[PDB]
């Protein structure tokens, strides 16, 4: 049901980590902004009604309560995305609606190392200060200020300190990421999930110039040559819109926030991507008939540069470790905790599941003289089939500096798949992983009664690693990034960049990408704060661009190398001549 009479200055596709802050910042500037979201209302502050029965009538949903964080693992359906082969949030708030909520003041090195000039640390520091003003951490999300079931934590944190590692409050010392441990920071506020759903979205829905369309999927963008006139929508659930939504004439811009796999899909379907992938959509049953003609295709490396943290699990067990079963907190919650979540917002349930114990980091100089960044996350839970009771799992992330990369491609079904596994292609990446375990072991060699299950004392760290299967299934961190890479090297000429420094899509005048897909690689940390920061930074850059000026007739409106305006002044049209030229006539 698309209304025959309306248009927007900005259309933002997808309501995730990138999209919600983008839509907020653009509407704050008084532009007409429409947020189009696949999924439904999630958290209570967005009008989400969904959740377990012990939550009735107290104005909370399954997405408000950090202790219910891990339900997505046993019950995801109608929530997780069905058009990808990996795990992603398809409700409002995207990933930030379903994840553990870990939230980090970024590490200045990450921006200096991963991004070209204009995105380095001195460039994005204002966006960092904005994002973290709206969402300061807490490493003690329970509103009374003290942390619960910390016995596991204290075992490890005293273990590490003894091993020569330094305690920090992570977000007070964002830049100290070598040989460091901290209480885990979260985006929570008032003991409720909070995040961008809690902050950016709330200021935006107070605005007249802001609109949200839920239960609505964007199929592709509607473009004449290099200029995007609108987006085409089919309902994902009844009550969603069918149609084609226009953007303000000439001026209008579209922002793709649909995610690392989401935005990539929309691009391919819009005739933007690699020749082979574009060819798959052309032969597709769903879009084949109505897809844009191949003369208007743009070749860019959409789907390449697929990146993720390489995850390696490890397990220990110790006597004073205390397990808590968060899965059992969905159905039959321990009643004092339920009582003491529902009234002052405290107790174990105001912490994310499972209990997420010490965060610790170190940086390893490799034989190639590349610095590789590690992050460990400890939790109280078994992992590798080790039992749940006294165990703690310590998961090692291989982050910034790792050189390997995979690929995302599309099926005839128009669902996305990871067809090149990104992990451990460079052996020096493996070397850092192994050395990190060795290092972890000697800091914990002095702890009384600590038992090493994974690896057990009968296997060497090296053997332990080489035996493992390298696949998303066992090794994914769910931190997928990079399919639409930001960079100065235009993809149409063979470069690696899908979008430019303004996040503008090469080959287009008005189309932009803000989400995890633009990152040249993964950062030190869980990315959500990074993606929010990037939303802050990109929206201000985009808002500093002057209004698009149309092309006078007889002028150039397009071509394979064209960087300029693709739209024609009133009284002439843009028509193709050859792949290097298009004129107004
Ligand atoms: C379960 C899990 C655990 C994780 N743990 C953490 C954590 O504790 N901390 C951390 O920093 N991050 C965590 N992450 C990483 C994180 O969730 C993502 O990195 C981040 O949310 C990605 O932001 P995004 O904007 O690129 O994607 P998304 O948040 O996934 O945004 C996608 C949004 O667009 C919508 N959408 C998709 N396609 C369309 C379409 N065609 N039309 C309209 N709308 C569409 C989706 O419904 C969704 O709302 C984890 C995520 C997973 C899933
Ligand atoms: C989007 O779809 C959802 C799910 O079907 C709709 O949410 C339901 O709304 C009814 C009444 O409006 C409630 O009784 C249900 O509890 C809701 N279900 C869920 C899962 O939230 C929602 O109304 C739809 N939104 C639009 C704009 O059409
Ligand atoms: C992180 O800190 C550790 C120790 O603080 C550094 O370890 C040193 O590594 C070099 C070789 O890379 C050795 O020659 C030194 O003797 C080590 N010192 C200690 C105390 O172990 C490590 O190099 C640091 N990493 C970075 C990237 O700064
Ligand atoms: C482009 O489209 C034309 C007509 O639809 C077709 O004949 C031609 O083979 C196509 N070329 C490619 C490379 O897809």
Keywords:
monomer; 585 residues; alpha/beta; FAD/NAD(P)-binding domain; Cholesterol Oxidase, domain 2; five-stranded parallel beta sheet; 23% helix; binds flavin-adenine dinucleotide; binds a molecule of 2 linked components (NAG-NAG); binds 2-acetamido-2-deoxy-beta-D-glucopyranose; oxidoreductase; electron transfer; lignocellulose degradation; CDH cytochrome domain; monomeric
Q: What is the strand and helix layout of this fold?
A:
Blueprint (H helix, E strand, L loop, with lengths): L9 E4 L5 H9 L5 E4 L34 H4 L20 H4 L9 H7 L6 H14 L16 H12 L3 E2 L12 E3 L12 H4 L1 H6 L4 E4 L2 E9 L2 E9 L7 E4 L6 E4 L5 H8 L5 H9 L26 E8 L10 H4 L3 H8 L12 E11 L5 E10 L10 E8 L8 E4 L5 E5 L6 H18 L6 E4 L6 H6 L5 H4 L35 E3 L14 H17 L11 E3 L15 E5 L2 E4 L1
Parallel strand pairs: 1-2, 1-9, 2-5, 3-4, 9-17
Antiparallel strand pairs: 4-11, 6-7, 7-8, 10-13, 10-16, 11-12, 12-13, 14-15, 18-20, 19-20
The structure holds flavin-adenine dinucleotide, a molecule of 2 linked components (NAG-NAG) (2 copies) and 2-acetamido-2-deoxy-beta-D-glucopyranose.
GO molecular function: cellulose binding; flavin adenine dinucleotide binding; metal ion binding; oxidoreductase activity, acting on CH-OH group of donors
Family: Belongs to the GMC oxidoreductase family.
GO biological process, one term: polysaccharide catabolic process
């Amino acid at each position: 049901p698309v209304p025959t009479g309306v248009s927007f200055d900005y259309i933002v596709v997808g309501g995730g980590a990138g999209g919600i802050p983008a839509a907020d910042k653009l509407s704050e500037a008084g532009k007409s902004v429409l947020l189009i979201e696949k999924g439904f209302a999630s958290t209570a502050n967005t009008g989400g009604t969904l959740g377990p029965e012990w939550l009735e009538g107290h104005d909370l949903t399954r997405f408000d309560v950090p202790g219910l964080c891990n339900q997505i693992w046993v019950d995801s359906k109608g929530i997780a995305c069905e058009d990808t082969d990996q795990m992603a949030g398809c409700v409002l708030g995207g990933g930030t609606a379903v994840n553990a909520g870990l939230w980090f003041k970024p590490y200045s090195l990450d921006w200096d190392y991963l991004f070209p000039d204009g995105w380095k640390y001195n460039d994005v520091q204002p966006a960092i200060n904005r994002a973290l003003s709206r969402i300061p951490g807490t490493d003690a999300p329970s509103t009374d200020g003290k942390r619960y079931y910390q016995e596991g934590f204290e075992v490890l944190s005293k273990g590490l300190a003894a091993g020569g590692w330094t305690s920090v409050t992570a977000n007070n010392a964002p830049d100290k990421k070598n040989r460091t441990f901290a209480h885990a920071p979260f985006m929570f506020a008032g003991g409720e999930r909070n995040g961008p759903l809690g902050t950016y979205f709330q200021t935006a829905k107070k605005r007249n110039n802001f609109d949200v369309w839920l239960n609505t999927s964007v199929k592709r963008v509607i473009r004449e040559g290099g200029h995007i006139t609108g987006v085409e929508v089919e309902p994902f659930r009844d009550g969603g819109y069918e149609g084609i939504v226009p953007v303000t004439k000439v001026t209008g811009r579209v922002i793709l926030s649909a995610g690392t796999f989401g935005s990539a899909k929309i691009l391919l379907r819009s005739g933007i991507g690699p020749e082979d992938q574009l060819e798959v959509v052309a032969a597709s049953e769903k879009d084949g008939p109505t897809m844009i003609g191949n003369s208007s295709w743009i070749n860019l490396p959409v789907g390449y540069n697929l990146d993720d943290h390489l995850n390696t699990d490890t397990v220990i067990s110790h006597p004073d470790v205390v397990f808590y079963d968060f899965y059992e907190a969905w159905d039959d919650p321990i009643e004092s905790d339920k009582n003491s979540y529902l009234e002052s917002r405290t107790g174990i349930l105001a912490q994310a599941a499972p209990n997420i114990g010490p965060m610790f980091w170190e940086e390893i100089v490799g034989a190639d003289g590349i610095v590789r960044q590690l992050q460990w996350t400890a939790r109280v839970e078994g992992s590798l089939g080790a039992p749940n009771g006294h165990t703690m799992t310590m998961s090692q992330y291989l982050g910034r500096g790792a050189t390997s990369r995979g690929r995302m491609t599309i099926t005839p079904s128009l669902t996305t798949i990871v067809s090149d596994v990104p992990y451990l292609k460079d052996p020096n990446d493996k070397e850092a992983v192994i050395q990190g375990i060795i290092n972890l072991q000697n800091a914990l060699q002095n702890v009384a009664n600590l038992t090493w299950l994974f690896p057990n004392s009968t296997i060497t760290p090296r053997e332990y690693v080489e035996s493992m299967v390298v696949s998303p299934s066992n090794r994914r961190s769910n931190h997928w990034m990079g399919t639409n890479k930001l960079g100065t090297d235009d993809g149409r000429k063979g470069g690696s960049a899908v979008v430019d420094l303004d996040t503008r899509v090469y080959g287009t005048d008005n189309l932009f990408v803000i989400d995890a897909s633009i990152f040249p690689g993964v950062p030190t940390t869980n990315p959500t704060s990074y993606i929010v920061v990037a939303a802050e930074h990109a929206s201000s850059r985009i808002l500093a661009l002057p209004d698009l000026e149309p092309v006078p007739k007889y002028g150039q409106c397009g071509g394979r190398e064209w960087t300029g305006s693709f739209v024609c002044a009133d009284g002439s049209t843009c028509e193709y001549q050859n792949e290097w030229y298009s004129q107004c006539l």
